[PDB]
């Protein structure tokens, strides 16, 4: 896709992540775990909610009948009405198809961008203490326990604390 993350360098989604749209899986000495990211999830949901608020509505224009259901209509005027109504229906059918196609494309690419923005946030947080594996994971070159993993997820990880350890493990 446009931003290269969802159906891109992220191989596939996680069916086991039911409390969020985006999140983390980690591996350390204590074991493995999973956690959803609130900020990225809500950013995506709020944008889709905004689309729904704009799209799911009708006009307030009051229309009256110009075609009799139960009696005859004039032949000349009736033909003009039929031409006009079918022309209007072609326009709305076209507009409806284009709207939903365009909006769907944007929704998919918007979701992709929020995945990438989360990935980019974490990359910059970790700084010189980790390396990208190419599949959406960061290999962290220091002991990073459950509290350390929480600090990465919380956006409170201080790279300076682990830099000496990490550069020794990375570069030797």
């Amino acid at each position: 896709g446009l931003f290269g993350a969802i159906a891109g360098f992220i191989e596939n989604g996680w069916e086991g992540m039911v409390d969020g749209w985006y999140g983390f899986r980690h591996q350390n000495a204590q074991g493995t775990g999973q956690a959803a990211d609130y900020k990225s999830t809500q950013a995506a949901i709020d944008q889709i909610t905004g689309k729904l608020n704009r799209i799911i509505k009708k006009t307030n224009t009051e229309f009256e009948s110009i075609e009799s259901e139960f009696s005859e209509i004039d032949h000349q005027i009736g033909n003009v009405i039929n031409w006009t109504k079918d022309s209007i229906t072609d326009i709305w059918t076209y507009q409806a198809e284009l709207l939903v196609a365009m909006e769907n494309q944007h929704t998919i690419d918007m979701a992709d961008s929020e995945m990438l923005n989360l990935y980019e946030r974490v990359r910059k947080q970790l700084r010189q203490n980790a390396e990208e594996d190419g599949k959406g994971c960061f290999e962290i070159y220091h002991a990073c326990d459950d509290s350390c993993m929480e600090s990465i997820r919380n956006n409170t990880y201080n790279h300076s604390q682990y830099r000496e350890e990490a550069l020794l493990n990375r570069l030797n």
């Binding site: 729904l52 259901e69 139960f70």
Partner: protein
């Protein structure tokens, strides 16, 4: 070896297919419908002073066809017309009928005002017919009078009647012209004299002659009564001059305000509200589009030639 943190996104086992600019078979985690396919099979009339006409045609409300006896006056914001409604008990038709029906179906009520027309002793003003029955008895259009000679064969006397609009709003006046089945019948009802009906206001002028040409029986009657109408402006007079063949108005109509005219087959429900109506009932959807019918009235979703149009409400579904 290094510890690891992995970034990811959710997925579902069963995704939903949507169309995009570049892909007609795009799988997403969730989607929602934008085209309404369902209707309520009732006319949702909560919050509306509505009138269901039943077998009464709107035009029959002005002339007083028996089927319209409960609907000669009233007020409403919504007027419901039904299939096979009756306007004419006696064989005939209204000139400029479509414009008249539309005026009535745009109205918010009807009031009736007496013309005050009177007739001399040689006129029978209470002509009736088997075509227009009221409970097994011969009758006539309630807002009109069939004038004939009281003595069979005698010349109907020259008569002039005037209705003045004393109101500040325009009134709608209707009259009929009787077209007899034969010369003998014409002579019996109106005499051997040449017949002529003149109608004249400040804004309207016309002349009519009863015609006696041979024509087939409709409900056993070769005669016809055709209706004509005009608007009488505030303060103006309309003058009828006639010597046989006029079906004269006993009252005129005043159309009050505005209302929504609905043509539908659906029964009334006073417990639901709605702003959109069609032949089959009411559309209460929040969706922008619908595929029920191109013929709707009120505040409606737009009609589209489409069964479904799914709007994505989630990311691309990439299952495990």
């Amino acid at each position: 070896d290094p510890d690891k943190i992995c970034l990811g996104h959710h997925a579902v086992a069963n995704g939903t297919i949507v169309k995009t600019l570049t892909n007609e078979q795009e799988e997403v985690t969730n989607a929602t419908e934008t085209v309404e396919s369902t209707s309520l099979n009732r006319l949702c009339m909560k919050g509306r002073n509505h009138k269901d006409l039943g077998n009464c045609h709107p035009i029959g409300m002005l002339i007083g066809t028996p089927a319209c006896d409960l609907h000669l006056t009233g007020t409403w914001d919504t007027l419901i017309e039904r299939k096979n409604a009756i306007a004419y008990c006696y064989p005939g038709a209204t000139v400029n009928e479509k414009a008249l029906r539309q005026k009535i179906m745009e109205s918010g009520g009807i009031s009736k005002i007496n013309t005050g027309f009177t007739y001399g002793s040689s006129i029978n003003s209470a002509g009736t017919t088997k075509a227009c029955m009221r409970n097994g008895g011969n009758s006539f259009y309630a807002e009109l009078k069939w004038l004939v000679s009281k003595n069979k064969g005698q010349n109907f006397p020259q008569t002039t009647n005037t209705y003045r609009n004393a109101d500040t709003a325009e009134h709608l006046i209707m009259w009929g012209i009787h077209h007899p089945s034969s010369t003998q019948e014409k002579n019996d009802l109106y005499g051997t004299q040449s017949l002529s009906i003149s109608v004249g206001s400040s804004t309207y002028k016309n002349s009519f002659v009863p015609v006696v040409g041979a024509r087939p029986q409709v409900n056993g009657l070769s005669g016809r009564i055709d209706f004509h109408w005009t608007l009488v402006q505030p303060g103006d007079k309309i003058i009828f001059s006639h010597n046989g063949g006029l079906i004269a108005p006993s009252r005129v109509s005043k159309l009050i305000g505005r209302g929504l005219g609905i043509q539908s087959e659906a029964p009334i429900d006073n417990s639901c509200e709605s702003k959109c109506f069609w032949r089959g009932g009411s559309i209460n959807t929040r969706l922008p589009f619908q595929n029920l019918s191109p013929r709707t009235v009120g505040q409606c979703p737009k009609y589209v030639n489409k069964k479904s149009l799914m709007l994505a409400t989630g990311m691309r579904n990439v299952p495990e």
